[PDB]
Design a binder for this molecule. Structure first.
Ligand SMILES: Cc1cc2nc3c(=O)[nH]c(=O)nc-3n(C[C@H](O)[C@H](O)[C@H](O)COP(=O)(O)O)c2cc1C
Ligand SMILES: Cc1cc2nc3c(=O)[nH]c(=O)nc-3n(C[C@H](O)[C@H](O)[C@H](O)COP(=O)(O)O)c2cc1C
Lengths: 116, 134
């Protein structure tokens, strides 16, 4: 199976909703595709589906760089704490890469998750 | 009663490929189901090989087809070697010989410390007018 989680967001809709996750994402995070479709990926920074705030131990500096990289259309790589649906911790080595469309808009961002 | 993974797999919008950037000549270590379905090549046929077989017209042609854009192929080579990103359209072929326009994105993965361990390819297959006739 894939060595990594794969995520595709729609870069044209507001706030990068997920339109696809692969089976490694589902297996490792314990969320199912149907639960996460249309949501922003940031719920992974909250400890389980009932925590309403980002966890203190997710590095706000990395989050902030992710936001910037997305805003500016440029690739990203870094590591931040995430959580499985059962609230258990995940170290997510994350790479984001924009997909440019026919001309010359970003249509998609791809996320690649190496859990380490 | 568990809930299965992969329920919306049929909606995957692109091919995904992973190569081992450490081993020689970027051999493929994973392809997803979109890749298989669109190219007609099934994972067992492609693992261990370089992705360039897709530039040959089907599995019994040993060399890249002359209508594949050799300039673009060169840039791909350069971006991989320089450890940088690539996005471009490239003519490929299904196993059945039919033409494929492959909007390919390559992105390197840096590992623990602190070198490229993988490359991810993302394929958005799009339409062409290219048609090699009956
Ligand atoms: C394609 C894509 C994949 C993402 N994957 C993750 C992820 O796996 N884990 C995570 O914490 N954030 C991920 N994010 C980041 C959040 O969705 C969001 O960009 C981040 O939390 C910063 O924005 P914010 O301050 O508004 O929360 C991803 C973003 C995109 C666009
Ligand atoms: C991760 C990855 C995915 C690739 N995807 C394929 C592809 O789908 N189609 C293709 O023609 N080449 C693809 N390539 C490109 C070839 O493998 C090769 O790098 C390219 O043709 C340039 O090298 P060459 O001139 O030695 O053949 C991919 C390369 C990498 C690293």
């Amino acid at each position: 199976t894939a060595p990594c989680g794969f995520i595709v967001t729609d870069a044209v809709e507001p706030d990068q909703p997920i339109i696809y996750v692969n089976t490694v994402f589902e297996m490792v995070t314990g969320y199912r595709a149907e639960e996460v479709l249309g949501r922003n990926c940031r719920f992974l920074q909250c400890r389980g589906p009932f925590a309403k705030r980002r966890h203190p131990l997710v590095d706000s500096m990395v989050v902030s760089e992710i936001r910037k990289c997305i805003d500016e259309g440029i690739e990203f790589q870094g590591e931040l704490l995430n959580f499985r649906k059962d609230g258990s911790p995940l170290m997510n080595r994350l790479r984001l890469t924009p997909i440019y469309g026919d001309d010359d808009t970003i249509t998609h961002i791809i996320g690649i998750q190496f859990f380490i």
